[PDB]
Amino acid sequence: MKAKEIRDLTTSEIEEQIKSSKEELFNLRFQLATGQLEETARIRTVRKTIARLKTVAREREIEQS
RNA sequence: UUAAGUUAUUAAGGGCGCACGGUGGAUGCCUUGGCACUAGAAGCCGAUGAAGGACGUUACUAACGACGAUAUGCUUUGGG
Numbered sequence: 001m002k003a004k005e006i007r008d009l010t011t012s013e014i015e016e017q018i019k020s021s022k023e024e025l026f027n028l029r030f031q032l033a034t035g036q037l038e039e040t041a042r043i044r045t046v047r048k049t050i051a052r053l054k055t056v057a058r059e060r061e062i063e064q065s
Numbered sequence: 066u067u068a069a070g071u072u073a074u075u076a077a078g079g080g081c082g083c084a085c086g087g088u089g090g091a092u093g094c095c096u097u098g099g100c101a102c103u104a105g106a107a108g109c110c111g112a113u114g115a116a117g118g119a120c121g122u123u124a125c126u127a128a129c130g131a132c133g134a135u136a137u138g139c140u141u142u143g144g145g
């Protein structure tokens with residue numbers, strides 16, 4: 001998910017998205033450990049999505065001040 | 066046939082010459098790195114936590130670079 005869609009989202013929605021993305025990343029890591037993950041690029045995709053969500057949240061709590 | 070006399074061949078190995086190999090890394094050519102300077106800029110960083118490090122971050126990750134739990138990177142503005 002890109003920064004434009006994230007900026008469309010609301011702050012509570014960003015927090016919920018961060019939670020769900022973290023759960024997805026964790027499940028991917030567990031599948032990788034057990035040898036059940038073929039689509040390894042998903043891990044990096046989700047990690048960068050989490051980074052973008054946090055970046056936008058930080059931008060908002062900065063512009064608030 | 067006998068007698069007297071003379072002189073070779075031998076190369077176990079060695080010497081000189083030559084041919085062909087091996088080792089070794091001189092020499093020539095080369096340069097990715099140095100050395101000495103010129104001109105212009107700049108001449109500090111740190112409790113808003115420095116210099117320098119440790120430990121981590123990748124799909125697989127021992128090491129160097131980069132990066133810091135937003136980790137082998139995030140946003141934005143321009144270039145292409």
Ligand SMILES: [Mg+2]
Pocket residue numbers: none
């Ligand atoms: Mg651009």
